[PDB]
Amino acid sequence: MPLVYMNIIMAFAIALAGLLMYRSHLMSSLLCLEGMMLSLFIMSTLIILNTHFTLANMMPIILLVFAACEAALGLSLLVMVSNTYGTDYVQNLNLLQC
Amino acid sequence: PGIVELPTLEDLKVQEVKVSSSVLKAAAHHYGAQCDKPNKEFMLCRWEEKDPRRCLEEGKLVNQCALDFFRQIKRHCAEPFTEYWTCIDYSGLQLFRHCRKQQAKFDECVLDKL
Amino acid sequence: MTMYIAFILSTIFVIGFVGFSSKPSPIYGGLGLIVSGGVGCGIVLNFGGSFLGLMVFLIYLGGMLVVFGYTTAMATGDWVIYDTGDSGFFSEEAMGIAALYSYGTWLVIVTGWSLLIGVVVIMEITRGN
Amino acid sequence: MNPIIYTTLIMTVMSGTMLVMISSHWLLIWIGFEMNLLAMIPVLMKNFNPRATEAATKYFLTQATASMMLMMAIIINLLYSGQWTITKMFNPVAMTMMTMALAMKLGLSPFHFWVPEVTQGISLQAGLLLLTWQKLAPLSVLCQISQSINPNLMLTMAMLSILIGGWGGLNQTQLRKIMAYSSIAHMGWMTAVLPYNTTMTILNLLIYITMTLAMFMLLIHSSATTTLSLSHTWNKMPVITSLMMVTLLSMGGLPPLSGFMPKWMIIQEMTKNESIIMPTLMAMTALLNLYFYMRLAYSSSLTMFPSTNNMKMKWQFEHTKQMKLLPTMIVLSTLVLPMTPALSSLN
Amino acid sequence: MWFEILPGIAVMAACLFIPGMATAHIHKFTNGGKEKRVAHFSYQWNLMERDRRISGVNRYHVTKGLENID
Amino acid sequence: AGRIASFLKNAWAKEPVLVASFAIGGLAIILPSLSPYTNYAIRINRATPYNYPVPLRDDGNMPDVPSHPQDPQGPSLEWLKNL
Amino acid sequence: PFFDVQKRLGLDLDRWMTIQSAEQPHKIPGRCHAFEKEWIECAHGIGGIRAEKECKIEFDDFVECLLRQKTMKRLSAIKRQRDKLIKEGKYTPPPHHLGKEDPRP
Amino acid sequence: LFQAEKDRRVLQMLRENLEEEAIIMKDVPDWKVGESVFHTTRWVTPMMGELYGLRTNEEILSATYGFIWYT
Amino acid sequence: MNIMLTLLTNVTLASLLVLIAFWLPQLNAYSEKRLPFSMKFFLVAITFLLFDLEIALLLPLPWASQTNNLKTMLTMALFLLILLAASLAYEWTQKGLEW
């Protein structure tokens, strides 16, 4: 497993870590999710092209589309959250508690 | 686990055909029509053995037959053929369509000659 | 060997990823993600994925991150593992992608249904009340 | 929302779950998970209020993170072996990655934090859907790859889930959070037997689904979301409270009721694999679940809490809409112990 | 009158004349007096590489005709 | 029958773009299934050689496979040239 | 769990995209087609545990074809030894490596 | 003809690499010259780094990215 | 390399021109003296994103036309476009394209 794959998994790791740190600004959480998807697409495309798996060339497209769909969903939710509070801050979602 | 076996450099020595891609393209149809049998030997053996190390003799045979074909072409119609390949070389995509007139000459020459 | 161009591109990828992972000023995070996406599409293009890299550059950058920036503005080692043979008189990536309509009938059906349901769901959520 | 739209969304959720269940390609399983998540959000937000929106946002974030982790695991498994089929995982890193992904999807501890809040925010029907139907696809995926999972991580997370559910159920006054913690504990019980027997997992899943369906339908029939609001039901329909008390006793694993069937069998199978300490710990921990079920029974049926005058008008009305299969769910979740050996049907 | 617009337009035309024509001459100056060979699909690229190896001067456009067959 | 014709009239006025779009869509949907040249297009797609035709080893029991390209046996592409 | 609807109805909904050696368009082969074919033939109709204990050689060959860890390690060792020996100054590189030597079609 | 020339060229590069590896590894204790990394004896198509590994960087970059970068 | 060099040249020339434009007039001494969050624009952005995803799905058609499964490819492409038109119609009739 070469060094470029190491770099891409490392980028995915930083994206996941940044998603889990949660300073504020849920939009940053969506950005971290979307960077995770971009890293997934990059690594999957590299794997598929290196091994010449022809029929697997569909898988990136599909994945991208689905993730982008999820992106829209998140944005919509974010907007509604903002409409309730005026800001997309993380701490404003403290109504429900354990 | 094991040692790979590779043929010696002497076994890969053969009189390579030394024409450009345009020259090969110009005579491609006659090359396929005339040199078909050794080419089919080589291709069938290559697709059956799945081993480059077991297909050297047929490669030498197809090179020899191609050399024979080009020697005949040079002997019989050097002038007609030269004009035709030259036209092909000029085109960026090496299109047959662009210079039909040259082809009519070469073909008839070959039809008269060989 | 241009000093491991793929390695340099990967390093810039990780650099942009850690730049936007600190989550400063979400517009700046989007800028870092733009740079990272461009670098990754460059990685794909240099590897040989012309159409998939151009899909990244078109879809991702021009629609998805553009919508992200729009909504934000609303608010406040290589060369060794490579191949040896040729592809023929075409490109394997394009044929594999275009085989979607011949082989991936199930994939097209499920993806189209998901897209239509997504449109419906977006309208449902954005209605409000 | 529009009844046609609601039916379409429900069918889309069920179709995504079925696609996960009947597919053999990893990308199709991921697509089914994405479809389920995409169609689940409006269902959680059918009744619009800030609570529902916040719960839906929490659920979406958790499920999107879990799906990203699952796709990363699939990509790693493909990288170390060019395979897309759902089989042996061929890699330990991919296995632990997708193990945590499925644990987060199922709400198993330590990924249990979202379950009580998402259940509390959404309505009773959406809570029923979330706690019953949304457990089939991840459990099916786990059952398909049970030979590759590391027993240590499975057992640790299952024991943590049971302990956390038992401890957290004690401090709750809201019934929906009680249901969420009960679901967490039962999920730990289901998961603790996956490395040994998936048939036990499926049997426990069926029993738990029947019990929680009966309990949720009883809670919908008597529109109560809190212990105090539930304490008033005896003055309008005591039969409902009596059936509820019997079902609550069953949910605690008390013999000869139905809830004793899974635990017993699970314990037996674990003792077949020379594991004695863990089943004992799980039983003594489920004692806490039984304790808070008994407290709810005390506050529900075995004693008569004070009532209100305005209940008299409620005496003059009958439920216009009646749920079907509720008697069947209660009977199945209470009195099917003598037909225990039927589990040989590989349910 | 209206033909007084023509001078500036002419300049524009001259400007738009320069790039493409220049490229053509460039492609004729660098590719041995012929069109620049296009290479998609990786087969004609192999043809160009073989021509470069055959020529002996490390230039693909130096064609070796029949006189090189001996 | 009168209601449908009246609806088509009312739609052709004050809504011509939608009428044209629906007409073109219906024609594009229905016409290919009854056009006789789709089989010709399929046959043309079959006739394009992208790969090398690998010959078969002879065993003296294949009278239909030609031994040389010029041999009369095998598929004939005269139909395409006549088009 | 797994409801094998495809095998019951003979549908082939998603089995065409599972493996490299399964009917690629235009007969384009995978990079490790033969290795995966051999592994599948070894492990077919035997079960999981027996496939893992008995078809270990085929899977090792397939994974080596996929990732080329051994080949890269050997090439890196050769490169390291040649670089060290050239730094010491006892080996002179051949003309073919230099690129001075003429190419063959 | 292109196929035949390709096999001959690839075999020649492999033979030269074997000769230089044998020259290079005369002194290392546990090495074996021209040893395969596969259990099987079937022919395996060599990688890009197997043929051009011991050659110059200019030809390495050519053989790797010539078709990709040619425009 | 050629595309890299072209991009580098364009970027360098643009940077030089902008730098000169911003600095040449800066050397001579001179005087040197909300909430609304409209939803319709967000909706149009979202539907643009969804239609862009469907366009991305539709893109490989020029190579999809040479497959020997002409009936299947034609049916699948017409199905994709029918679903696209259905999404547009659904957004139209539910008052989703209004101002």
Place this chain on the structure above:
Amino acid sequence: MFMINILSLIIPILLAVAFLTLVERKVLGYMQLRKGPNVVGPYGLLQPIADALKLFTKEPLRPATSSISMFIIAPILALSLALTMWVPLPMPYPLINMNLGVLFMLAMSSLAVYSILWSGWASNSKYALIGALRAVAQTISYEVTLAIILLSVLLMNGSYTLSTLITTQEHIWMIFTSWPLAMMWFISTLAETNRAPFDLTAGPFAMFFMAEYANIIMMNAFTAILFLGASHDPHTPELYTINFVLKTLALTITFLWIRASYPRFRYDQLMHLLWKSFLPLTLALCMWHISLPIMTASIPPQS
């Protein structure tokens, strides 16, 4: 000699967009019963030089509170994209020959909105932010139908290669095969560049102006290649170059014609125009052009 080729591609485009301002002014004046600039120079032939020097000598107004970073990035990106767009164009031989030239141009046009977005954000004004959001939404909305029309038209070409469009139109123009698509494409190109009737919105301003006008000439050249094909003789490319330049000039003069001939739309009016008249018809024509080669057995060759 590649750098010389790049320079000989770049500089003439800058000179052409320099003199296009004078051509537009003179054409508008003569269409308005007056003259254009005819005093500074023999026929205003030195007017662009005077305007360039005057713009390059005038003080720039930094808002004193704006973010400098994106404020300076935006014109660089705009001008770089405008100059990069010309690269794949075959006239008749492209500087860089790409397989997916059309996809490259589409991706760069998609990138083009980022300059507008960043300039709007960096203005530090709510009104300018509203205007920028409005323009970005319009641009992406018309980009949708741009992409759909482009793919439906290329379905009769066989590939995304730009040079093959010359071979495709060897005998007939594609204006005859699909004039409705060309009509909608012309209107969409008018809409993308914020030109009349869709134009609802010193140094950096000058750079943005060059980017916009280079985009205009680019779009006219692309339309001319796409729909008004010329005959290319490999033994004389100058004929194709002259034909292409003349058609591009005709299309640009036509752009000035619609600018001088009509009033402008409202924003909701053009949004409704697109989403309720072009998109349905565009989808119908996309299905029609998908089915047409199959039903007539005239599928383009390359794959």
